[PDB]
Design a protein around this ligand. Sequence first.
Ligand code: 9TG
Length: 353
Amino acid sequence: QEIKKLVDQNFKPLLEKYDVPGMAVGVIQNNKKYEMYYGLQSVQDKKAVNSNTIFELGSVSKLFTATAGGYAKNKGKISFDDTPGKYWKELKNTPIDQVNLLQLATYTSGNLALQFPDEVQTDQQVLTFFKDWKPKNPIGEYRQYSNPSIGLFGKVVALSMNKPFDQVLEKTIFPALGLKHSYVNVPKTQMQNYAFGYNQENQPIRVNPGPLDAPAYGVKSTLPDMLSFIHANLNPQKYPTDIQRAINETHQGRYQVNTMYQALGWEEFSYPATLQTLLDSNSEQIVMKPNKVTAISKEPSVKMYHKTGSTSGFGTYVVFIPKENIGLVMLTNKRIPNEERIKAAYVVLNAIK
Ligand SMILES: *[B]([O])([O])[C]([C]C1=[C][C]=[C]C(C([O])=O)=[C]1)[N]C(=O)[C]C1=[C][C]=[C]S1
């Protein structure tokens, strides 16, 4: 194959350009996996990145939250027209027991920001924050990307299965996806495999506990595991029917913001997509500001899906195209610009032609 050469030409230069210590790039094509490893999981230890290296997925964790929601919608445990009060008994008749589970999951409450305020930390300050919530935009009309929005979806999904969110992933979702080294909490036996992240001053760091962190950005995984996740997204037919259902649920577009369709967790596009369309989904306009949605008008015949993710120390990108039977995963232990991630992947996936 030329896959190794294409990844070297497009991903490898980025390590020197952004002083990234380590990178794992995976490609899956026609059911065959390719794994490319570069550099170091730990600078101080001179430990090489390899197939056992655990990275922070950041906002790619939202795809797991969405899958978890899809699984609970299919076991009859929740409905996407329901509201959080039906599960968080404590939150009835507040202006937020008026937002649906789908609207939380898809960022359209109309007044929820990217982050909680710093003072919000304990379970008791989170329970308190949602009661005081009040609308601003007409519900359902405006997309603002948001950790609290999908985090609340996550806790509500977990209440429905009667389990804390971490056990829903580690006991139900991850095993159903055949993932063997994916974690919300990395155990002791695996700590030697958890990479250091590196901040913009090249100091070693890992993610800080934060409010509703697990459902919004708290999953850690390996390249083989993410390639399996992509495999399952490219082929849900082979998987247990419960998880198959869950997966198809995350692929359904719910609304448009120009050329971007919002699905559950995933961002969806018409394929082939221009580079600029993919970059727009990660523009300041799209990620950081409110944008008014529209109903899907053009239902694309052939679709592709992506998502970026970051913690302070780590970068992640995942993209797949069902009807070329291909996909790519990039994991780094230092952030690089979202646009760089999206472009390299673009060149590589087009060249496997
Ligand atoms: B998630 O990765 O989308 C989410 C929000 C975020 C943080 C940094 C950069 C982007 C981006 O450009 O798309 C998005 N991540 C987190 O909340 C964890 C953090 C990462 C950095 C500071 S907190």
